[PDB]
Ligand binder design. Structure first.
Ligand SMILES: COCCOCCOCCOc1ccc(C(C)(C)CC(C)(C)C)cc1
Ligand SMILES: COCCOCCOCCOc1ccc(C(C)(C)CC(C)(C)C)cc1
Ligand SMILES: [Cu+2]
Length: 123
């Protein structure tokens, strides 16, 4: 019953327009625990430490630099721009473990699509 799955799947293709530039600026692994009810429904890893990046189901193959835990609905609230991640973090709806600062980066980076998309041009 998970809507985030669409977002994570679509992310794998976005990294073809954006991957190599994100990896250069982030250089870290991110694990995501999506919860339905109060139970984990899906786990996702966004590896941004090599190449254009990787997104795969399940816990981080290696050790993850940061892990984020939030409900499936709230995850949609965030990716749609309605729920600021820090507001969710301090209200308790979003939980973050590891290097929080690196997730706040992944956030700034991906909100500026123009810089990294053009820098990903070969021409
Ligand atoms: C707004 O700048 C990004 C330009 O590309 C967006 C095209 O997609 C339509 C907008 O809907 C989306 C799609 C994907 C996303 C995610 C969550 C995958 C973030 C992204 C596109 C930066 C990887 C957010 C909104
Ligand atoms: C010290 O800061 C205190 C508040 O901490 C907030 C921690 O942030 C949690 C994660 O922040 C995010 C939120 C969304 C995202 C995106 C939208 C880029 C994730 C995505 C593209 C995988 C949907 C990245 C990082
Ligand atoms: Cu922001």
């Amino acid at each position: 019953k998970l809507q985030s799955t669409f977002v994570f799947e679509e992310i794998g293709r976005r990294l073809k327009d954006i991957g190599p530039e994100v990896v250069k600026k982030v250089n870290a692994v991110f694990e995501w625990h999506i919860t339905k009810g109060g139970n984990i429904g899906a786990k996702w890893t966004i590896d941004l430490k090599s190449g254009s990046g990787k997104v795969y189901q399940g816990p981080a193959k290696g050790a993850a630099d940061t892990t984020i835990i939030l409900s499936d609905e709230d995850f949609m609230e965030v990716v749609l721009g309605k729920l600021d991640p820090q507001k969710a973090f301090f209200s308790g709806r979003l939980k973050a473990r590891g290097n929080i600062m690196l997730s706040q980066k992944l956030a700034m980076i991906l909100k500026d699509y123009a810089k990294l998309g053009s820098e990903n041009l070969y021409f």
